[PDB]
Design an enzyme around this catalytic site. Structure first.
Site, PDB file in Angstrom:
ATOM      1  N   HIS A  62       0.850  -1.246   0.000  1.00 22.21           N
ATOM      2  CA  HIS A  62       0.000   0.000   0.000  1.00 22.21           C
ATOM      3  C   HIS A  62       0.839   1.230   0.000  1.00 22.21           C
ATOM      4  CE1 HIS A  62      -2.558  -2.979   2.159  1.00 22.21           C
ATOM      5  NE2 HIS A  62      -3.313  -2.667   1.106  1.00 22.21           N
ATOM      6  N   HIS A  92       5.543   7.037   6.618  1.00 20.33           N
ATOM      7  CA  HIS A  92       5.229   6.588   5.236  1.00 20.33           C
ATOM      8  C   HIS A  92       4.650   7.820   4.485  1.00 20.33           C
ATOM      9  CE1 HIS A  92       1.505   6.262   7.439  1.00 20.33           C
ATOM     10  NE2 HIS A  92       0.972   6.667   6.277  1.00 20.33           N
ATOM     11  N   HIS A  94       1.909   9.139   1.079  1.00 25.87           N
ATOM     12  CA  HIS A  94       0.911   8.905   0.032  1.00 25.87           C
ATOM     13  C   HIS A  94       1.219   9.829  -1.089  1.00 25.87           C
ATOM     14  CE1 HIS A  94      -1.674   6.974   3.190  1.00 25.87           C
ATOM     15  NE2 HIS A  94      -0.999   7.790   3.988  1.00 25.87           N
ATOM     16  N   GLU A 104      -3.471  13.470   1.007  1.00 31.22           N
ATOM     17  CA  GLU A 104      -4.740  13.047   1.557  1.00 31.22           C
ATOM     18  C   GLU A 104      -5.465  14.275   2.105  1.00 31.22           C
ATOM     19  OE1 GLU A 104      -3.749   9.560   4.114  1.00 31.22           O
ATOM     20  OE2 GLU A 104      -4.578   8.580   2.316  1.00 31.22           O
ATOM     21  N   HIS A 117       3.446  11.035   6.468  1.00 34.39           N
ATOM     22  CA  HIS A 117       2.832  10.871   7.820  1.00 34.39           C
ATOM     23  C   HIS A 117       3.816  10.189   8.741  1.00 34.39           C
ATOM     24  CE1 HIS A 117      -1.366  10.590   5.780  1.00 34.39           C
ATOM     25  NE2 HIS A 117      -0.982  11.852   6.004  1.00 34.39           N
ATOM     26  N   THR A 196      -6.129   6.670   7.951  1.00 34.96           N
ATOM     27  CA  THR A 196      -6.703   6.850   6.600  1.00 34.96           C
ATOM     28  C   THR A 196      -6.650   5.642   5.748  1.00 34.96           C
ATOM     29  OG1 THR A 196      -4.591   7.554   5.581  1.00 34.96           O
ATOM     30  CG2 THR A 196      -6.005   9.324   6.688  1.00 34.96           C
ATOM     31  N   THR A 197      -6.221   4.480   6.283  1.00 32.37           N
ATOM     32  CA  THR A 197      -6.377   3.201   5.597  1.00 32.37           C
ATOM     33  C   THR A 197      -7.185   2.326   6.553  1.00 32.37           C
ATOM     34  OG1 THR A 197      -4.298   2.154   6.485  1.00 32.37           O
ATOM     35  CG2 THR A 197      -4.181   3.484   4.437  1.00 32.37           C
TER      36      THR A 197
HETATM   37  N1  LIG Z   1      -2.465   6.458   6.569  1.00 34.14           N
HETATM   38  S1  LIG Z   1      -2.141   6.958   8.143  1.00 34.14           S
HETATM   39  O1  LIG Z   1      -3.306   7.481   8.810  1.00 34.14           O
HETATM   40  O2  LIG Z   1      -0.916   7.730   8.201  1.00 34.14           O
HETATM   41  C1  LIG Z   1      -1.947   5.412   8.969  1.00 34.14           C
HETATM   42  N2  LIG Z   1      -2.851   4.222   9.120  1.00 34.14           N
HETATM   43  C2  LIG Z   1      -2.488   3.193   9.864  1.00 34.14           C
HETATM   44  C3  LIG Z   1      -3.212   2.104  10.062  1.00 34.14           C
HETATM   45  F1  LIG Z   1      -4.390   1.956   9.507  1.00 34.14           F
HETATM   46  C4  LIG Z   1      -2.646   1.037  10.944  1.00 34.14           C
HETATM   47  F2  LIG Z   1      -3.391  -0.010  11.111  1.00 34.14           F
HETATM   48  C5  LIG Z   1      -1.458   1.171  11.510  1.00 34.14           C
HETATM   49  F3  LIG Z   1      -0.937   0.268  12.279  1.00 34.14           F
HETATM   50  C6  LIG Z   1      -0.656   2.330  11.315  1.00 34.14           C
HETATM   51  F4  LIG Z   1       0.546   2.519  11.857  1.00 34.14           F
HETATM   52  C7  LIG Z   1      -1.227   3.307  10.480  1.00 34.14           C
HETATM   53  S2  LIG Z   1      -0.487   4.921  10.009  1.00 34.14           S
HETATM   54 ZN   LIG Z   2      -0.754   7.757   5.992  1.00 41.69          ZN
END
Ligand SMILES: NS(=O)(=O)c1nc2c(F)c(F)c(F)c(F)c2s1
Ligand SMILES: [Zn+2]
Length: 258
Positions: A62, A92, A94, A104, A117, A196-197
């Site tokens: 992803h 990570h 996007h 995002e 992020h 956001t995932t």
């Molecule tokens: N896209 S995000 O909000 O930066 C973001 N999502 C997640 C997520 F769904 C997880 F399950 C997780 F373990 C994370 F460390 C992140 S970090």
């Molecule tokens: Zn993210």
């Protein structure tokens, strides 16, 4: 349908397995800069990354995560809208297929080429799996990328990507200093939201920096050579791995700056 961004399993499908996708505090959101209110009660953020220990970079199918040692309080985020201490666990990004999309969060509906992020968890909950079950469990620092001049501190990340092309590949990634990814200013907007995932849990205090960082075209082109697919599978370029803005509902975005 395991979820993804593709033509048939992308963000508009996620609600079928993850009904919280239509919840009251989903991320990301559009930041209307005219409506966000300055909150003189908010503090300067404290980003304490001097002792950060990076370990490994992983293509998870992803995105790619740069992972840190969060077994003690090395790299922490404190202050701003936060109570207590939040430990860095990974960062990570996007990004888009072209420079006109990728972030995002949006700012007065503007989409940036990508969004970084830095993910942190609240140490009062002991571990990350516990923290994500709490409304104040995570703090994610969001930094927009625009295409312009190269970002020198991003080049070590860009150079390793050829070694984790496909899903499930990882590589050593020690001694990386995430301070090299920050902009000059720490002015920010903040609001309560979500991952956001999937699983899209509503456990995040978002802190989104106003000042984007600049990266070069060449740097972001390399992000777009990664693959969603595993080794030996037909190639699916890893691009447009961003969730679109969600309804703000009954939420207030606060600005740290006048
Ligand atoms: N896209 S995000 O909000 O930066 C973001 N999502 C997640 C997520 F769904 C997880 F399950 C997780 F373990 C994370 F460390 C992140 S970090
Ligand atoms: Zn993210």
């Amino acid at each position: 349908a395991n979820w993804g961004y593709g033509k048939h399993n992308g963000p508009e499908h996620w609600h079928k397995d993850f009904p919280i996708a239509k919840g009251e505090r989903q991320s990301p959101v559009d930041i209307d800069t005219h409506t966000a209110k300055y909150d003189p009660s908010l503090k300067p953020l404290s980003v304490s990354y001097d002792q950060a220990t990076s370990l490994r970079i992983l293509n998870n199918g992803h995105a790619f995560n740069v992972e840190f040692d969060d077994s003690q309080d090395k790299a922490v985020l404190k202050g701003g809208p936060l109570d207590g201490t939040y430990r860095l666990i990974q960062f990570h990004f996007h990004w888009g297929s072209l420079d006109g999309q990728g972030s995002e969060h949006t700012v007065d509906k503007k989409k940036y080429a990508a969004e970084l992020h830095l993910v942190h968890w609240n140490t009062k909950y002991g571990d990350f799996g516990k923290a994500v079950q709490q409304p104040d469990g995570l703090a994610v620092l969001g930094i927009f990328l625009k295409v312009g001049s190269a970002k020198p501190g991003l080049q070590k990340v860009v150079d390793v990507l050829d070694s984790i092309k496909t899903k499930g590949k990882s590589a050593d990634f020690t001694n990386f200093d995430p301070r090299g990814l920050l902009p000059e200013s720490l002015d920010y907007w903040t609001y309560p939201g979500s991952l956001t995932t999937p699983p899209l849990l509503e456990c995040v205090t978002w802190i989104v920096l106003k000042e984007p960082i600049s990266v070069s075209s060449e740097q972001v082109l390399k992000f777009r050579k990664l693959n969603f697919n595993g080794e030996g599978e037909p190639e699916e370029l890893m691009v447009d791995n961003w969730r679109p803005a969600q309804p703000l509902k009954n939420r207030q975005i606060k600005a740290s700056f006048k």
